[PDB]
Symmetry: C3
Subunit: 136 residues, 3 copies
Amino acid sequence: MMKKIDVKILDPRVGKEFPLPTYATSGSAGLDLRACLNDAVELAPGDTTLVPTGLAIHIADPSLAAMMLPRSGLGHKHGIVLGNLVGLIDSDYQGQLMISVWNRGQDSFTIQPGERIAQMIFVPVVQAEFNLVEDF
Amino acid sequence: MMKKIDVKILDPRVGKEFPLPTYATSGSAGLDLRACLNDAVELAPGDTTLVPTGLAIHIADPSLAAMMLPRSGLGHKHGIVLGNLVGLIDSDYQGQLMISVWNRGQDSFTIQPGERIAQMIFVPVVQAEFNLVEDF
Amino acid sequence: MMKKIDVKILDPRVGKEFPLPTYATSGSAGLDLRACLNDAVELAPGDTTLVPTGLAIHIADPSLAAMMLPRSGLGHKHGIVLGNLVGLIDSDYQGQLMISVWNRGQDSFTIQPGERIAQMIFVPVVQAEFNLVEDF
Ligand code: EMC
Ligand code: EMC
Ligand code: EMC
């Protein structure tokens, strides 16, 4: 299920120091996002840091959203997850994609420039039109 | 992608002390949910509390579900997230929407009556019909 | 919205020591997943453990994915959630479903063999085809 999504590159290292996000396979659900950093960031246990990506998207279609999730291995094996748990990207958001990275475990972890640190999925969304009732 | 969803108001302060949830824009994916509280609740680091909303929905359509997520800023900046991480609302649920609020950070936070504390998205869902195989 | 999904049973206790996952009702969004364990696992506060299910799926349809979520009560009441927060299962994954269980709270918890420890939802997904722009 393909959908064209506009992407703007904000930092000149993207596509060159490290690549633009790509699906691993035609059956992949997520896209890995990489840390756009001038220097590595050490995260102590319990620490949160805001990691730029150097990228912006504009989904535009109000029937689509993106969700940012932890990478599976980072989360399970290293306790490196998202500070907001799941990061919802609305169809009208056009700012830089920023990743809230939280060390939920007990071991310090250093995020290297270019390292894949999160993933993003695109899912259909619906807007509720509420119908007020006083009994179901 | 609009869908009519029945909503029932359980507490008389809703729509008056604070408003019914509304989408910020026609491109918003989520709806913010507000804390329906008689008094402010201080959450110490590591603390979880169950926050009422004063609202119930009945999605009814078995091809739709809701997901409750942290607010982005609360999560990243203040460590105020969900104790169940992501809260799934089934199409047949008709009870009050309750928010499990967890302080995952290091700073105490007080939830004020009426404060937006979570968000909710509506997503299509599929029920699996399993086909048992002994090799893929 | 039903979709046939191939399932393979990897451990002979499945469907016999404990059952194959089933939807509670025709309106349920999620499927509970059970711990396939030879002995109970005590999780101290802050601990993560990798729990087998004894099952594999092969979604196959690149327009569908699965998301593994905490159970609501386990998360809110007991602080038993997922170490990767949300676990994304791609359409091409055909390995065993493994659950990263993390004790995010302050009380030790023992996972019993057969206990329901997570839930899984099936959601449509889209693959982005990026359109590079230099201004939105
Ligand atoms: C770090 C600004 Hg890429
Ligand atoms: C707090 C019952 Hg609104
Ligand atoms: C625990 C191998 Hg079921």
